[PDB]
Amino acid sequence: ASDTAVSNVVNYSTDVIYQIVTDRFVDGNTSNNPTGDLYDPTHTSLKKYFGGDWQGIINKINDGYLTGMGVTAIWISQPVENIYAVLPDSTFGGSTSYHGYWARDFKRTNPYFGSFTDFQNLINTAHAHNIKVIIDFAPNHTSPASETDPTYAENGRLYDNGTLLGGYTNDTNGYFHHYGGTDFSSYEDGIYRNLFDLADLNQQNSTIDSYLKSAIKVWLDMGIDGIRLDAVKHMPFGWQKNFMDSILSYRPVFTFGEWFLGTNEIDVNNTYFANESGMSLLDFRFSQKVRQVFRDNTDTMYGLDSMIQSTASDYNFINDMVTFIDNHDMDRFYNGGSTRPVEQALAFTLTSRGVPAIYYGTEQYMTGNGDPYNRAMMTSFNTSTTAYNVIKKLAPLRKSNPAIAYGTTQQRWINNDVYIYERKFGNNVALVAINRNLSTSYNITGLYTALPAGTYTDVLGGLLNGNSISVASDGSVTPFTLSAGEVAVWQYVSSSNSPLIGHVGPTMTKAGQTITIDGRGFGTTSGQVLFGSTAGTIVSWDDTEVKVKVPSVTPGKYNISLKTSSGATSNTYNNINILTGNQICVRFVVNNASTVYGENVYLTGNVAELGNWDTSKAIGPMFNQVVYQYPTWYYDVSVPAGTTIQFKFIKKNGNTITWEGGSNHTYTVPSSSTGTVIVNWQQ
Ligand SMILES: OC[C@H]1O[C@H](O[C@H]2[C@H](O)[C@@H](O)[C@@H](O[C@H]3[C@H](O)[C@@H](O)[C@@H](O)O[C@@H]3CO)O[C@@H]2CO)[C@H](O)[C@@H](O)[C@@H]1O
Ligand SMILES: [Ca+2]
Ligand SMILES: [Ca+2]
């Protein structure tokens, strides 16, 4: 099998995701439509059900709309059962669960979308057409509730395959967080507090932890090829890391979370998450910058490049970052005026690092500022749009040009309006020229490239006013004019490659598991995969793909390297996280840990999951507000189940490290349910 295989659910670098808002796409079956207040046949009441269903998607697949576009994957709304109540709205006079973000039963389907049967047809049909199916998943909450008024909505009631677990009011079981609502003041504030009025789930609760894990297996069993975790910014890192392990242990599938970042916003917690959570993230830094440059004009091409560079240093796995120019939460990219800007944003995105995602209707020039104006019904299905063709032409490149899929990014020419970058993966190359100026042409001189000597034509076929170029023996390019709004794409696909690792998934494993190595020039005869210096067991060997079983090495981060049967050594793919064992979520609590100003408390310990006594990699700074109040600190950490750990807390400020006194604390991590440890600061 090849990395481009639809069966390659662990890699998305060569794919193109098409984000669909189920209800607003296509009503393939009217018989399943809602009745009364819920439904709106007219499609004018933006907060009501329109009738979009899985059958409608199936139709768009079978009819060639999506396929003809070059889309290799689809990301649909949460398939789980939603509340049935019609919330009050002043503007739209009615607010429903049309979006599927108000869960009611994570073990059942949304009757309006279809049945498990209709879901299967979707999965199957999609697969038969070589399209991967991604689903939205929001384990952070249920629905909008009011502790005071159990008469509001459905009180955020949670069901387990029909049987009620509990509501928001009278939550004797402690399934929810009754800490009020978040104001985004702090990281901890937005975790243990309500996201708006949504009933916050207490994943620390054994029942909830188990429920959520089993709930996901239901869908994994349905044949899904990916998951989009909702509000990963509103749940504890520890629990999420532990949740990921359960998924990857059951059946690995590409997973990416939603960590909202504003304009010019950079969050260290966000970076750490993407680097340790065991899941990928939506590239908000990318998305927000692209809009600044191509849409709102609040930054230059210089800002775009710096984003490309800073991004590449922060993220350990940039090839996994899910890019995009807009979404159901943002104002539609197209905001009137010229359509050139969108196309340039699409082309840039399609040829840039990571995994591109396209919001439904982008190719239709759909407009709409703010929710729910940005969630209008599918306008038209015209395949003539310049935007529709852009995707059609560029999408496939991700499969044909490994440089576009896993290659690096390097600037070759840049001014305030012009950006000429180059994607390189060995000998394979891709050169893209963009001129944001819709009225100014530029004379390009002094340009150099890795493109072999010769004459290159535009892959876009002049679609965006692009043309051909000539590269000299010294990689120099003949001076040319970059007309206004021009977009050109030149490439060179090598005929022969050396061992080159482009991708590795998953990035979070355990000894005995199987990882998939994607790249080029591995050979047809089995070679050797090494986790540092320790060789693994080959499960399958191909020129572009290698499946290997993780060796029983010391749990920790490892660097992957390949070795063809001919002795040729590949490049290394670093920071593969090898855990100690099955993860479990344990809450650490330490009392009487008073500190000075600017001093925080951290957790260090016996295992890799605990940093292995490395104070620089200590867990924290620990929390001290919501659940527990200072001087008592706490934190949700993922640890190896059934393991006896030795730990100790420390205080860190910036230039000082105060360890806890006495002997190390000892604890045996549970095997099933979640756990909690409470200790007192040793002097
Ligand atoms: O040869 C010395 C010089 O070479 C390298 O410079 C290259 C730039 O890195 C590259 O950006 C490009 O420069 C263009 C600028 O992007 C643009 O602002 C405008 O000024 O046109 C320039 C083209 O001349 O090309 C040059 C090479 O031609 C290298 O990076 C430098 O450190 C070094 O000084
Ligand atoms: Ca319908
Ligand atoms: Ca939460």
Residue 222 buriedness (CB in 10 A; 0-12 / 13-18 / 19+): middle
Question: How far is residue 257 from each of residues 230, 274, 551, measured CA to CA in Å?
Answer: 6, 9, 29
Which residue range forms the structural domain that includes residue 515?
496-579
Look at residues 400, 416, 448 and tell me which one is the last residue of a structural domain.
400
Determine if ligand 1 sits within 6 Å of the CB of residue 446: yes
Same domain, residue pair 349 and 440: no
Cα separation, 372 vs 384, whole angstroms:
27
Same domain, residue pair 161 and 241: yes
Determine if ligand 1 sits within 6 Å of the CB of residue 476: no
Q: 51 a known binding residue?
A: yes
Cα separation, 496 vs 475, whole angstroms:
20
Q: Whose CA is nearest to atom 9 of ligand 1?
A: 412
* Other Cβ atoms within 10 Å of 165 Cβ, number: 15
Cα separation, 334 vs 517, whole angstroms:
38
Same domain, residue pair 68 and 207: yes
Same domain, residue pair 538 and 552: yes
* Look-up of token digits 């296509």: 26
- Local structure of residue 339 (DSSP, 8 states): S
Q: 665 a known binding residue?
A: no
Contact between residue 240 and residue 231 where contact means Cβ atoms under 8 Å apart: no
Q: What is the CATH number of the domain that holds 435?
A: 2.60.40.1180
The verdict on whether 258 is a catalytic residue reads: yes
- Local structure of residue 27 (DSSP, 8 states): -
Q: 331 a known binding residue?
A: no
Q: Whose CA is nearest to atom 12 of ligand 1?
A: 413
Q: Whose CA is nearest to atom 29 of ligand 1?
A: 412
Contact between residue 219 and residue 135 where contact means Cβ atoms under 8 Å apart: yes
Determine if ligand 1 sits within 6 Å of the CB of residue 415: yes
User: What strand order describes the sheet that includes 487-492?
Assistant: 408-414, 418-425, 428-435, 487-492
- Of the candidates 53, 58, 36, which has an alpha carbon nearest to the alpha carbon of residue 45? 36
On the question of a cis peptide bond just before residue 372, with omega within 30 degrees of 0, the verdict is yes
Same domain, residue pair 80 and 123: yes
Look at residues 371, 400, 429 and tell me which one is the last residue of a structural domain.
400
Cα of 201 to ligand 3 centre, how many Å? Answer: 6
Same domain, residue pair 531 and 674: no
Of the listed ligands, the closest to the CA of 417 is 1
Q: Three-state DSSP class for 657?
A: strand
* Residues 14, 428, 559: CA angle, nearest 5 degrees: 70
Determine if ligand 1 sits within 6 Å of the CB of residue 414: yes
Contact between residue 280 and residue 254 where contact means Cβ atoms under 8 Å apart: yes
Of the listed ligands, the closest to the CA of 233 is 3
Q: What is the CATH number of the domain that holds 234?
A: 3.20.20.80
Same domain, residue pair 313 and 424: no
Q: Whose CA is nearest to atom 17 of ligand 1?
A: 414
Same domain, residue pair 523 and 598: no
Q: 228 a known binding residue?
A: yes
Cα separation, 324 vs 346, whole angstroms:
9
Same domain, residue pair 606 and 530: no
Same domain, residue pair 514 and 417: no
β-pairing verdict for 355-359 and 17-19: parallel
- Of the candidates 74, 73, 70, 69, which has an alpha carbon nearest to the alpha carbon of residue 385? 69
The verdict on whether 599 is a catalytic residue reads: no
DSSP 569-595: B---EEEEEE-SSSEEEEEEEEES---
Look at residues 579, 608, 624 and tell me which one is the last residue of a structural domain.
579
Atom of ligand 1 nearest to the CA of 411: 11
User: What strand order describes the sheet that includes 254-257?
Assistant: 280-281, 254-257, 226-229, 132-137, 73-76, 17-19, 355-359, 322-323
Residue 87 buriedness (CB in 10 A; 0-12 / 13-18 / 19+): middle
Question: How far is residue 412 from each of residues 54, 226, 432, 490, measured CA to CA in Å?
Answer: 45, 35, 10, 13
Same domain, residue pair 431 and 556: no
Determine if ligand 1 sits within 6 Å of the CB of residue 443: no
Domains: count for the chain: 4
User: CA quadruple 368, 374, 380, 386: dihedral positive or negative?
Assistant: positive
Cα separation, 623 vs 634, whole angstroms:
5
Cα separation, 525 vs 540, whole angstroms:
10
Same domain, residue pair 157 and 201: yes
**What is the best residue among 413, 415, 421, 445 to mutate for testing ligand 1's pocket, by most ligand atoms within 8 Å of CB?**
413
List, in sequence order, every residue forming a beta bridge with 491; answer none if it has no partner.
430
Contact between residue 360 and residue 71 where contact means Cβ atoms under 8 Å apart: no
Experimental approach taken: X-ray
- Tokens encoding 285: 């830094």
Of the listed ligands, the closest to the CA of 187 is 3
**What is the best residue among 414, 419, 449, 478 to mutate for testing ligand 1's pocket, by most ligand atoms within 8 Å of CB?**
414
